[PDB]
Design a protein around this ligand. Structure first.
Ligand SMILES: Cc1c(C)c2c(c(C)c1O)CC[C@@](C)(CCC[C@H](C)CCC[C@H](C)CCCC(C)C)O2
Length: 251
């Protein structure tokens, strides 16, 4: 593929972390595909990926699911079986199922990093990106307390140029008034392209959400074929089964 050997050589010359994550063709292609084979942009992304991991060890060091298995079992997250019409993988996060008295913002962030490291293995997802739906129903001030300026900047970094996944859309639904101050904290760090891709649906989201995700949503959101619990169980099992791959990319 165009630029693969050049990207490997740069990484080697720059002395990027020896291991884990050998510089296989499959690994490097994630970076080239995320940036449409633009070598310089792929290289910037690769360096940023390593930078972010080194700067956020609380989240990145151990990707084994044992630290967040309770959060998965609580029903916080699921991945749809089907892709959207543009081929993006679709992720669902439910704030009401995150108990901030038990899990920190770092733990919750780790869930997304685990899912992201798993789904990036799919070439269709490297090509078509992802969309994430956050159901903010139940957002509390106790969740907001966990979103410090540091965490806000880390969120903005992975959405923009620190992880090899194209964020094609972020859909916030059921956002309560009190969430505005939290989003305002993240906003200053986002690129214009990402801000343009964050949709605020509000409390009457059904029609608008279905327009973006026809025929693939769970029953809870207007879908008609399966439930959120079905997808949360299916994804949690897959994460559990992937514990050793996650171990191999852990440190
Ligand atoms: C690679 C990748 C990661 C790692 C990722 C996300 C996406 C789309 C990615 O492609 C979205 C979620 C996020 C940024 C982790 C968020 C963790 C926090 C603690 C969740 C609750 C608070 C948020 C204020 C809720 C809305 C977030 C959106 C503005 C993304 O992690």
């Amino acid at each position: 593929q165009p630029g693969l050997a050049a990207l490997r050589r740069r990484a080697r010359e720059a002395g990027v972390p020896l291991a884990p994550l050998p510089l296989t063709d499959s690994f490097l292609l994630r970076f080239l595909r995320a940036r449409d084979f633009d070598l310089d942009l792929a290289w910037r992304l690769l360096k940023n990926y390593y930078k972010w991991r080194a700067e956020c060890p609380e989240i990145s060091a151990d990707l084994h699911p044992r630290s967040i298995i309770g959060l998965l079992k609580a029903g916080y997250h699921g991945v749809l079986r089907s892709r959207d019409p543009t081929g993006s993988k679709v992720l669902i996060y439910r704030i009401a199922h995150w108990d901030p008295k038990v899990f920190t913002a770092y733990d919750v962030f780790r869930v997304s990093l685990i899912t992201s490291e798993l789904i990036v293995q799919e070439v269709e997802t490297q090509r078509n990106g992802i969309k994430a739906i956050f159901d903010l129903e139940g957002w509390q001030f106790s969740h907001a307390f966990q979103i410090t300026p540091s965490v806000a900047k880390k969120i903005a970094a992975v959405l923009t140029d620190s992880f090899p996944l194209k964020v094609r859309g972020i859909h916030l639904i059921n956002e309560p008034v009190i969430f505005h101050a939290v989003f305002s904290m993240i906003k200053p760090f986002l690129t214009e392209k990402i801000k343009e891709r964050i949709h605020m649906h509000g409390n009457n989201y059904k029609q608008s959400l279905l327009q973006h995700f026809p025929d693939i949503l769970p029953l809870e959101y207007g879908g008609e074929e399966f439930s959120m619990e079905d997808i949360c169980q299916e994804w949690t099992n897959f994460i559990m089964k992937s514990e050793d791959y996650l171990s191999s990319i852990s440190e």
